[PDB]
Design an enzyme around this catalytic site. Sequence first.
Site, PDB file in Angstrom:
ATOM      1  CG  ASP A 189       5.578 -26.694   9.748  1.00 33.18           C
ATOM      2  OD1 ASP A 189       6.324 -26.467  10.325  1.00 33.18           O
ATOM      3  OD2 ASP A 189       5.704 -27.569   8.599  1.00 33.18           O
ATOM      4  CE  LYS A 206       8.297 -21.347  20.109  1.00 33.40           C
ATOM      5  NZ  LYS A 206       7.299 -21.696  19.015  1.00 33.40           N
ATOM      6  CE1 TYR A 224      10.430 -22.463  16.921  1.00 32.23           C
ATOM      7  CE2 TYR A 224      11.029 -22.557  14.845  1.00 32.23           C
ATOM      8  CZ  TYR A 224      10.493 -23.019  15.511  1.00 32.23           C
ATOM      9  OH  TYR A 224       9.422 -23.947  15.583  1.00 32.23           O
TER      10      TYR A 224
END
Length: 272
Positions: free
Chosen positions: A126, A37, A19
Amino acid sequence: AVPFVEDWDLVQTLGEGAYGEVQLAVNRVTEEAVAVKIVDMKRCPENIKKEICINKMLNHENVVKFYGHRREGNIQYLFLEYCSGGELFDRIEPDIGMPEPDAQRFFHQLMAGVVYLHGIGITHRDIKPENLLLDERDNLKISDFGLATVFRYNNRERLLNKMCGTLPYVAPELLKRREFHAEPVDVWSCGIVLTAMLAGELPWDQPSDSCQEYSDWKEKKTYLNPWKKIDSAPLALLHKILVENPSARITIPDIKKDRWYNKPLKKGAKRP
């Protein structure tokens, strides 16, 4: 005041996620290095928006720092702390792990980061070696809040039901119950990370009764491959963390009281 201090050069790619991508940015004037990012909202507007929101709440030495973000049409630019040491994943030697003292230090820092997040009501959801980065002094930094969420607001806990994370690291209740408490799920993944650091291998594909490796663990067959390479001290802690019933699973305050957790094992940095 100073002209080009807002200019950053993208020197190299740190990693191209499913992504977007992460680029190493160096300031034109100061040469300060940060991670940027880049996510093409057209390639999620809300998802990214929540990640930014959660990031604005973060301020801890064991959590990747958020410096800010830039609109730029549809391309979001998140300025994050650059961790030159790379991923913890790359410090784990396949089938062997790493020196126990090193694993203990990283585990201490992981707990510090998770205690902080939980204290502010956020769950990462996660946790795994790929999302645990290292700075120049090998300090651990929890990374990527794309799946994180608030589980406590106004002193009221919200039970979760979203199935997310990474199978080998996910808690068994996420696969068998409709709802579950957020904290024990992060505790469980930290336990799998500890197992990986100490044995260089993941114990099972997933925590299901259908998974033979998981059944063997519940049957206490620690003479098997992963567990036989660990310790009775750290193994005893893993026995308290990888407990199927999340209500009986050890909490972090109790992990901090564990014998192995408190065993003197590693010297401080060389000459410091």
